Amino acid sequence: GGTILVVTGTGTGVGKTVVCAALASAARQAGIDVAVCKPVQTGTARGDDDLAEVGRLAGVTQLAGLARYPQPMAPAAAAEHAGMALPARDQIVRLIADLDRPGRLTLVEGAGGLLVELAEPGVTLRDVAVDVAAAALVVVTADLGTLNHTKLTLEALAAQQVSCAGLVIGSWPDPPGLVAASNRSALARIAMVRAALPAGAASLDAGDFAAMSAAAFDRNWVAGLVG
């Protein structure tokens, strides 16, 4: 195959989609082929479409979804409110494996934080990660509380021997206050911090977002993701 990364986060609203787009953008400019996959997508009735937003910021054309629920809730609840069911575990794995391909980087963005239920019964993105032998990239905030949430998430990853590919601070304020600056230093002691995306990046146009994306990550780390 190729390389699969699940792109998880310490919670919902932390910047997973923007990180998916930025890493996708940076890997494309390195000549790497990129697919982004969004198996469970809630809140469509509010115009939430994470695949579309990755396409809008990054120009990614290989977008694969699967389940779509109208309400902006946890997938279990959004499905119950629509009269629908959750996908099965193997349905999600199949969607990912069909994208996987030598030389391709396949990013898999979850619904919210790592332990959210994606498929019956209580199947999470952690289980999906184990099935496809993927590593997890954890998107974190710079805000008060991020150290605990990060440690909890990493611990839950190691419970099932899912490797951590590093952290990404989804939104990095300019200028950074005392708490942000301190947290960035402390997060670096817990794991490799791969990038710190500037706040408001979704308002950068194609070229600016691509500029920001290449500068955000270490070139050698991005290139070493896929052989």
Ligand X SMILES: C[C@H](N)[C@@H](CCCCCC(=O)O)NC(=O)O
Binding-site residue positions for substrate: 38-42, 145-148
Does 41 engage in binding with a copy of itself (CB under 8 A)?
Answer: no
* C-alpha closest to that of 72 among 102, 37, 94, 42: 42
Partner whose footprint covers residue 41, from ligand X, Mg ion, a copy of itself, none (CB < 5 to 8 Å by kind): ligand X
Q: How many Å apart are CA 22 and CA 67, to the nearest integer?
A: 24
Sheet holding 33-41, edge to edge: 63-68, 33-41, 104-109, 3-9, 135-140, 164-172, 193-198
AA identity, residue 182: S
Q: How many Å apart are CA 40 and CA 65, to the nearest integer?
A: 7
Partner whose footprint covers residue 186, from ligand CTP, a copy of itself, Mg ion, none (CB < 5 to 8 Å by kind): a copy of itself
Does 87 engage in binding with ligand CTP (CB under 6 A)?
Answer: no
Q: Closest CB to ligand CTP among 3 and 17?
A: 17
In whole angstroms, the minimum distance from the beta carbon of 227 to a copy of itself comes to 33
Residues 113-142 that bind Mg ion (CB under 5 A): none
Q: How many Å apart are CA 195 and CA 190, to the nearest integer?
A: 14
Q: How many Å apart are CA 78 and CA 86, to the nearest integer?
A: 9
Contact track, ligand CTP, 36-65, x by CB under 6 A: --------------x---------------
User: What residues does 65 pair with on adjacent strands?
Assistant: 38
Considering 25, 32, 36, 38, which one is annotated as catalytic?
Answer: 38
Contact track, a copy of itself, 121-160, x by CB under 8 A: -----------------------xx-xxx-xxx-xx--x-
Is 151 marked active-site?
Answer: no
Residues annotated as part of the active site: 38
